[PDB]
């Protein structure tokens, strides 16, 4: 049985007609942000399906084509996720063994012309917008984000609370594989990379799914022992510190890089039939740090406006978060048409406890301390959707 890198290399070595079956090519893709969770989840789903299909858990229930895991960014952008690069290096997964947007385009182009391209979704529950023209059918979903209630016939269809999607993927496959210890060993570093970064080392956003996934990994990684030592948890701590420091490291990146490396885009519907195109960048350093590293406030804001225009956005929002002295802090910066941004912010400012520190809503660029440190992009987006629905048009 192949390890994860061996499986990926094997996929790369095959003709596309041996990956597709009866003129269906099946993939598994995460979300447009391509974070640790999206990448770990997609690779894990694809790998577990492969092991399941060739083994004896799937005796008298046959079938089962290969699933190509896709990371939904240009290959070159992987390097902006220094945490992910570290986890892959540790499992000896080479970038040339992975499949990015370019690879998915090559597959679509080189497959026979009547082949359907179907997708499992992990770490999202509707198809990333940029892939809507490539994916014919959604066949299955496992996710932990707000349920959009689409593709209700998907199999599986798991959209449940979880610190990490990777926990849900792992647990689903663990049951189907009857706890196969070799599989657990082979995926645990990648899985733990996602779970630990998502839960800040099992201290935040922890759900029953995460606790169970961690318990299963510990049981395998410890093996038969008389006494459980502190070593396993110490090793998880050192691993977490390595990944966290790297996620927190955006030194040397351009403003464009920083804005695009953890980014999501939406079209909100309002009272007008025209929607609001809005992008949200999640960033790991405070605005003052960003300004100092990028030629000062004015230079930085100009680069933001450039990014906005390039992505065709009515509104660009930056959400920063950091920790110092055991205290969490957040900021929210918004750029867009003065009319719309003032109305949006005025409608969410109480809930997010926003305090202006820069700019002016009448000017279309404004910067706020966000004293509601619990609200992440996952909450900010619904708050802004609700605000936008109340605007006159
Ligand atoms: Mg996730």
Curated annotation (Swiss-Prot):
Names of required cofactors: Mn(2+); Mg(2+)
GO molecular function (one): metal ion binding
GO biological process, one term: polyphosphate catabolic process
Taxonomy, superkingdom: Eukaryota
Leading EC class: hydrolase
Entry-linked InterPro entries: DDH_dom, DHH_sf, DHHA2, DHHA2_dom_sf
UniProt keyword list: ATP-binding, Hydrolase, Magnesium, Manganese, Metal-binding, Nucleotide-binding
Catalytic activity of the protein: [phosphate](n) + H2O = [phosphate](n-1) + phosphate + H(+)
Keyword field contains Manganese: yes
Binding site for ATP: 145, 282, 377
This enzyme's EC code(s): 3.6.1.11
PANTHER family registered for this protein in UniProt: BNIP - RELATED, EG:152A3.5 PROTEIN (FBGN0003116_PN PROTEIN)
Similarity field: Belongs to the PPase class C family.
Task of the protein: Polyphosphatase (polyPase) involved in the degradation of inorganic polyphosphates (polyP) that is able to degrade a range of chains from three to several hundreds of residues in a highly processive manner. Exclusively shows exopolyphosphatase activity, cleaving inside the polyP chain.
The protein's name: Polyphosphatase
Organism for this UniProt entry: Saccharomyces cerevisiae (strain ATCC 204508 / S288c) (Baker's yeast)
Designated gene of the protein: PPX1
């Amino acid at each position: 049985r192949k390890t994860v890198p061996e499986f990926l290399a094997h996929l790369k070595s095959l003709p596309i007609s041996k990956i597709a079956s009866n003129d269906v090519l099946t993939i598994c893709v995460g979300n447009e942000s391509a974070d640790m969770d999206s990448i770990a989840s997609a690779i894990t789903y694809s790998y577990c399906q492969y092991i399941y299909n060739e083994g004896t858990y799937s005796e008298e229930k046959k079938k089962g084509s290969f699933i190509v895991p896709i990371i939904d960014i240009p290959r070159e952008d992987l390097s902006l996720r220094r945490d992910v690069m570290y986890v892959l290096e540790k499992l000896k997964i080479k970038e040339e063994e992975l499949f990015f947007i370019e690879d998915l385009k090559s597959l679509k182009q080189n497959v026979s012309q009547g082949t359907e391209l179907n997708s499992y979704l992990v770490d999202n529950n509707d198809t990333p917008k940029n892939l809507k023209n490539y994916i014919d059918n959604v066949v299955g979903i496992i996710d932990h984000h707000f349920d959009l209630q689409k593709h209700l016939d998907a199999e599986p269809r798991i959209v449940k609370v979880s610190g990490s999607c990777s926990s849900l993927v792992f647990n689903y496959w663990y049951e189907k594989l009857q706890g196969d210890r070799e599989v657990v060993m082979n995926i645990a570093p990648l899985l733990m990379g996602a779970i630990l970064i998502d839960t800040s080392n099992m201290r935040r956003k922890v759900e029953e799914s995460d606790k169970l996934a961690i318990e299963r990994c510990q049981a395998v990684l410890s093996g038969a022992v008389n006494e459980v030592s502190a070593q396993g948890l110490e090793d998880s701590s050192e691993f977490y510190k390595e990944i966290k420091s790297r996620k927190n490291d955006i030194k040397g990146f351009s403003v464009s890089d920083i804005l695009k490396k953890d980014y999501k885009q939406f079209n909100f519907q309002g009272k007008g039939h025209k929607g609001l195109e809005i992008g949200l960048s999640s960033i790991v350093k405070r605005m003052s740090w960003l300004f100092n590293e990028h030629g000062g406030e004015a230079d930085f804001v100009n680069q933001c406006r450039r990014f906005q225009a390039e992505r065709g956005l009515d509104v660009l929002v930056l959400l920063t978060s950091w920790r110092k002295a055991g205290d969490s802090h957040r900021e929210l910066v918004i750029l867009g048409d003065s009319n719309v941004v003032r109305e949006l912010i005025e409608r969410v400012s109480d809930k997010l406890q926003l305090q202006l520190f820069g700019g002016n809503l009448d000017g279309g660029v404004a910067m706020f301390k966000q004293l509601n440190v619990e609200a992440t992009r996952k909450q900010v987006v619904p708050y802004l959707e609700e605000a936008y629905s109340n605007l006159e048009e």
